[PDB]
Design a protein around this ligand. Structure first.
Ligand SMILES: [Cl-]
Ligand SMILES: [Cl-]
Ligand SMILES: [Cl-]
Ligand SMILES: [Cl-]
Ligand SMILES: [K+]
Length: 226
């Protein structure tokens, strides 16, 4: 994955800017432009106006400018969701921020609010079209994240909004496996009531029951047996 897709633009080097232009030409089917159309770094790109972009690229400048704004607003929303800043989330969405923006790990605002326990933000994102089943780079969904971190009310809201109870990540772990690993008995019970496959096996040959034993969560193993 190229640097410019892994960094916020304020950190892009001069070379990153050139690579971004070439990436955008292909991603957005734009008229080709010379790699030196913007002889500057990312911090400099952020100083230019839309009119400056249009001057430098008559065919694509407006698009390029708006792609950068999309990244900036997306990052503010990710950070506001992570930090539980309900008011900032509200302002950013009213300002058009992408509710399905992703960070360097594939985490969306919904992933971050779910992982950090911010129930009101989870609810507002879902009401406004956040993808309840978005999968990060390793296959983790918002439901995995809420289950692993012990946020029962969020688990319930995600399930009510259509979260896949049996989604599996790159290691074959379902939300049930993660709840078992971290000892979250009440979450295990909710997942089971919503159709979690108690017999799902991870890439290491283990079920949730095995994981619960391995982690000393004997109360969970009890619930899983019966
Ligand atoms: Cl700006
Ligand atoms: Cl955005
Ligand atoms: Cl399985
Ligand atoms: Cl599975
Ligand atoms: K994602």
């Amino acid at each position: 994955l190229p640097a410019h897709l892994r960094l916020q633009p304020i950190y892009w080097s001069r070379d990153d800017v050139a690579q971004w232009l070439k990436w955008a030409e292909n991603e957005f089917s734009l008229r080709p432009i010379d790699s030196n159309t913007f002889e500057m770094n990312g911090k400099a790109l952020l100083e230019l106006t839309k009119e400056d972009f249009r001057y430098r690229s008559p065919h694509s400048g407006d698009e390029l400018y708006e792609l950068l704004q999309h990244i900036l607003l997306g990052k503010k929303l990710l950070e506001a969701a992570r930090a539980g800043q309900d008011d900032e989330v509200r302002i950013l969405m009213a300002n058009g921020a992408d509710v399905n923006a992703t960070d360097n790990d594939g985490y969306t605002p919904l992933h971050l609010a779910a992982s950090n326990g911010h129930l009101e933000i989870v609810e507002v994102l879902l009401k406004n079209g956040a993808d309840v089943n978005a999968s990060d780079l390793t296959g983790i969904t918002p439901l995995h994240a809420a289950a692993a971190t012990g946020h029962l009310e969020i688990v319930e809201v995600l399930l009510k909004h259509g979260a896949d109870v049996n989604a599996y990540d790159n290691d074959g772990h379902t939300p049930l496996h993660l709840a078992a690993k971290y000892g979250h008995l009440e979450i295990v019970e909710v997942l089971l009531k919503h159709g979690a496959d108690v017999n799902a096996q991870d890439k290491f040959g283990k079920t949730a029951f095995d994981i619960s034993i391995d982690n000393g969560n004997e109360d969970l193993a009890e619930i899983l047996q019966k």
